[PDB]
Write a protein that binds this DNA or RNA. Sequence first.
RNA 1: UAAGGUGAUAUGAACCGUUAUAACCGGCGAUUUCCGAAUGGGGAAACCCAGUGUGUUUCGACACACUAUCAUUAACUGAAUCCAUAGGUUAAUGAGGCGAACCGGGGGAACUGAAACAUCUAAGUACCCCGAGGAAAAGAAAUCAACCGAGAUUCCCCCAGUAGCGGCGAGCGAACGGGGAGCAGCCCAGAGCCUGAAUCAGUGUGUGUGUUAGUGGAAGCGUCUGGAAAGGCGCGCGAUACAGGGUGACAGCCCCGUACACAAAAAUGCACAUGCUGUGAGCUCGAUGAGUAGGGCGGGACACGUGGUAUCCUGUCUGAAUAUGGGGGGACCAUCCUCCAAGGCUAAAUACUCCUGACUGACCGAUAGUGAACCAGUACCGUGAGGGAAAGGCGAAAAGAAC
RNA 2: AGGACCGAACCGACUAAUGUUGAAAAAUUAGCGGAUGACUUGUGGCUGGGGGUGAAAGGCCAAUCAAACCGGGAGAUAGCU
RNA 3: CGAAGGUGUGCUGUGAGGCAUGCUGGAGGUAUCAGAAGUGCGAAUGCUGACAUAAGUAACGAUAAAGCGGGUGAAAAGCCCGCUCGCCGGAAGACCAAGGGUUCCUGUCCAACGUUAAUCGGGGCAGGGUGAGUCGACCCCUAAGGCGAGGCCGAAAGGCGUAGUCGAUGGGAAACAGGUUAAUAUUCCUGUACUUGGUGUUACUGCGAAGGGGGGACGGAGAAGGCUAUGUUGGCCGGGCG
RNA 4: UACGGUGCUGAAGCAACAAAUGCCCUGCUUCCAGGAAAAGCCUCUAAGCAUCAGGUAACAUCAAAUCGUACCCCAAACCG
Lengths: 46, 93, 63, 102, 37, 77
Amino acid sequence: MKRTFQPSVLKRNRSHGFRARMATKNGRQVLARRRAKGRARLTVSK
Amino acid sequence: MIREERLLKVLRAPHVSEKASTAMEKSNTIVLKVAKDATKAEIKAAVQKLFEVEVEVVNTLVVKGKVKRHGQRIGRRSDWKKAYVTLKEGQNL
Amino acid sequence: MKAKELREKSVEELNTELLNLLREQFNLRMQAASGQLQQSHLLKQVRRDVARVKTLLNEKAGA
Amino acid sequence: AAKIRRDDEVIVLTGKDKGKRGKVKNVLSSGKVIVEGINLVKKHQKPVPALNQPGGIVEKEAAIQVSNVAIFNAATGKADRVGFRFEDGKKVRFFKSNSETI
Amino acid sequence: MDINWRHNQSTFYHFTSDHRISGWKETNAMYVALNSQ
Amino acid sequence: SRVCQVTGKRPVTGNNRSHALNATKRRFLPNLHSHRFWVESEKRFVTLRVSAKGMRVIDKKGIDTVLAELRARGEKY
RNA sequence: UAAGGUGAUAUGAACCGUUAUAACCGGCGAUUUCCGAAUGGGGAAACCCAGUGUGUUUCGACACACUAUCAUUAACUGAAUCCAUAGGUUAAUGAGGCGAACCGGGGGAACUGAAACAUCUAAGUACCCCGAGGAAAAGAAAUCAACCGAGAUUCCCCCAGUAGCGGCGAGCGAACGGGGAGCAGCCCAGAGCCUGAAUCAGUGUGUGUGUUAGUGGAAGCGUCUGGAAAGGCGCGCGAUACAGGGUGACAGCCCCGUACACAAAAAUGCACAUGCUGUGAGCUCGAUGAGUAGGGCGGGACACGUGGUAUCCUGUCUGAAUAUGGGGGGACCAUCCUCCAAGGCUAAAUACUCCUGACUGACCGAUAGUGAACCAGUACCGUGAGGGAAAGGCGAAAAGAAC
RNA sequence: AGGACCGAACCGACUAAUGUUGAAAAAUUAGCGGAUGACUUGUGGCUGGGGGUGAAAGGCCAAUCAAACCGGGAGAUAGCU
RNA sequence: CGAAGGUGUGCUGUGAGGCAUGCUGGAGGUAUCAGAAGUGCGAAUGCUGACAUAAGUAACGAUAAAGCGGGUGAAAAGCCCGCUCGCCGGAAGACCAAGGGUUCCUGUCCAACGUUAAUCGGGGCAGGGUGAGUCGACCCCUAAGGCGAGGCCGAAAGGCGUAGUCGAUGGGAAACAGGUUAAUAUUCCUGUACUUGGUGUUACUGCGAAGGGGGGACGGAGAAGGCUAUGUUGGCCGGGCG
RNA sequence: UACGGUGCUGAAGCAACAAAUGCCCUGCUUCCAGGAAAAGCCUCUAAGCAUCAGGUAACAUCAAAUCGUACCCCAAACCG
């Protein structure tokens, strides 16, 4: 059956990637919480 | 021209294997590990000027590093670059 | 060798620069990775010696 | 500086070798020393198929603590503590109890 | 194995399915309730 | 934004109260109009978004003094 | 500082050094790829693609530097239009982003309580946003008081769960006045006399002290048990040092230290002194903050829910007097007292701990204490925001088991 | 010619049986409907929570939907167990 | 000359408890009298770890199917080789995109992983392996759409959007046959080619744009006609005469 | 012939017929539901440059960088 995760790298990055978190106020606050929690990978880039 | 300070840092090791060996003893090509940011003009110039031979053409691939592990600790090795340097008819090394 | 490099001219540290890279450094990387070169400490001392020549060369040139 | 150091002759104060004199072979940055003929352990090691194969039970010296030795006076013939004085800008060690520079 | 066992015990903790007991177990409880009314 | 360029009147907040005193949030807005003011010393029309008492204070202080205040506080006209 | 070193798992190999250019520690420098405000354009972060100028004795290819936007200032240009403004180009200076809490401001819930609920509460809390500093804010009476007086602001203990506010329910809750911490006043709206007169600010220099490496640092042996002694027994010594830690069991005297006494080539923080620059003292006279105070309507803040409601703030409509004047004194009037708004600056007491050092605990001791004593915000889960583990201890010494 | 006819791929899902601690958190097997169209499909894009989208079922919005998920207010409140 | 702890025994108090001691343990314990509590668990469909129970039970994942000989090995139903048998063959073959990321190939090991054994493996360990002017990306150009100097707007954050700038799933230059590696090949080698730019020489000469025009430039269905891939048969060639 | 293969040599290499859903065909016929854009490409010139620069043609020479390239890919390697 066709499950929910149908992967695509270009949609992974355009959607949840770094240049797209940095592109706005609230994604920069996301990166700030991931750095402050101290996190090995911030976004999902590769 | 390429400066000689750049041109010394490019070639890194001769690559020893059996594909390399049959490339030397069968098709004049010496195979050698180069700098990761080394272009084909740099490798050609560096073999022209550091082994004093005449290079016909260079073919460069980039080899991806293998994820090994020690114990239960993984790690990728490291990517390197391998240059197939096709020499002319007059060569030794 | 730190005062010894300090007392030459810019041209002469460019000469011993290119000879540290040329004669020493490259021939020991090629000699090291082809099964030869029992003496491995030479790699270290050559590398640090190029660091000295570039240091004195930056200090001599201008500021 | 360091009181017990490299080419120095010591006597052993505590354990298994109490009262045995000997010369310090080397001195390890754990705060230990290897002193010759003193703390002999009976290692037995495998004959590795590389370069030479001894096999057998090799009797080595082990590292004893620095605080378990003190340097041998030999003018009194007993153990003696060490101080540091300045003589002509040289920080020298000296024996306590007769105050002699080593 | 321990991590997979904790997550694979954590599988039906936030479920919704009402005809299946505990999210997964098949039954006849629809007919039992419906016949009780 | 709805700011008078002369008096600096933002919209403020408040309550609709009712006869049962039910508090609701509202905004009081300034009476902002975009009026075109002749300046004689420059021989030009400078158009401003004034309140309807920014026009009172322009009628009293004069347009030149007001423009000197806007140029003073970095308000660009 | 130094006789030993080349960081750890983690041994090796190859070496460096031993009286000084091994190594280690500190000050100041040098280098500091790529991404990231990312800033030459772009982009799916760690990649793609340039332009301009300078230089390159194989200049058919290389190397270096500059090129973001915005604000301010200046220069040169420049429309519709004549002058001119808009605009354009270049240069100089500044900003931009991150950060735990504290602080000021712009917005701002609901669950809950009222034994239902709508006024009220929760609560100007949570949260969102802007801005700033080492603190911020406030602050030098258009303030109280009460016919006596006090004398800026802030913080603490009372006042006092008081007066009051309150579907007069639930609840909310002062001030006056008293005791303390700390204490500091000034400038512009404006001319003349007069000048550098105190004042601070920016810098140099000198002194003192502190930080960033360090140095010296007392005094014990015998015997018994024991694998081992620091323990038992016997006899000594130190102490401005018996804080603590280690050492083969419990050490003042074995080791590192502690008390104590000293140490800086260099870079610095603070405090005096002093050089220069800027800045202005002080005197006489004058002025003494207008769409403002007040008002009508709507709303908010004041403990005070519009009530008899003073006072403050203002979205809207209006609108004075201006020292023979005006504000307040809790509706309001008169008498009396007090103060001078519509301009601004100002230390200390105060709040907080991302971070560093020292010390302390009738705090925890591995299901506890941090989620995390261990390569933990990891493994793993989730598209994502996010969620988030388990897992310490051989021995005194690997002597970690030759054969 | 045709929202034409029969019928594979392709899309679907009418019946039955199995399965129901499954081979599978919705399938398999045997039949079944559409199959040039209001079709089907790949790649990218857009719409967002009292909001979207809906040939409308309160359906769908990451195995979640009479109001998603995550985090917070938050130890809500619980005359009840 | 042996603490706490652990595990027995004996004595003792009305009880919670106390005391003595054997063995294990191997370094701490604490009277008395006061003081403070994370102060006493059998229950909370309690939380965490361990271990039972059913139970050596159901099951071992398509009813495409195996049989024998030989080899390797400590051991062979499963591995390798051979001969037979069966299954798919508009797929259960071959080549990719997406996605994964070394699983590829060779040697070596059988602990765990493989629903059994394993000598085997997509498992462990080590080494090797990915070669481009022509393929794809990058690049030039754009769609939907994104972002957006100024700008218009908005309590703040921010919304929209002009110039522009990005954005393929579309438009734009060029390579084919044969051979080869254990593992790459339109990339390496052999042969034969083609494309686009730079520079130089020579001959002729009007060149020149974020500007104008053309072109690129593009629907559904249907119908034949001409072909080819491909196949079948004959001829030819080599082999067989069972 | 390390029996795994490794080299050497190598005949014929034609014709007829059938034939696509591939090619001519981005065609042709027809039908309404009336069927992307922009660049490369070809042309025209404006400002400018005009015995220079540039354009065209031939020849020669140099360059074509960088990253992907293994392997699975209807699957035991992707989503389950």
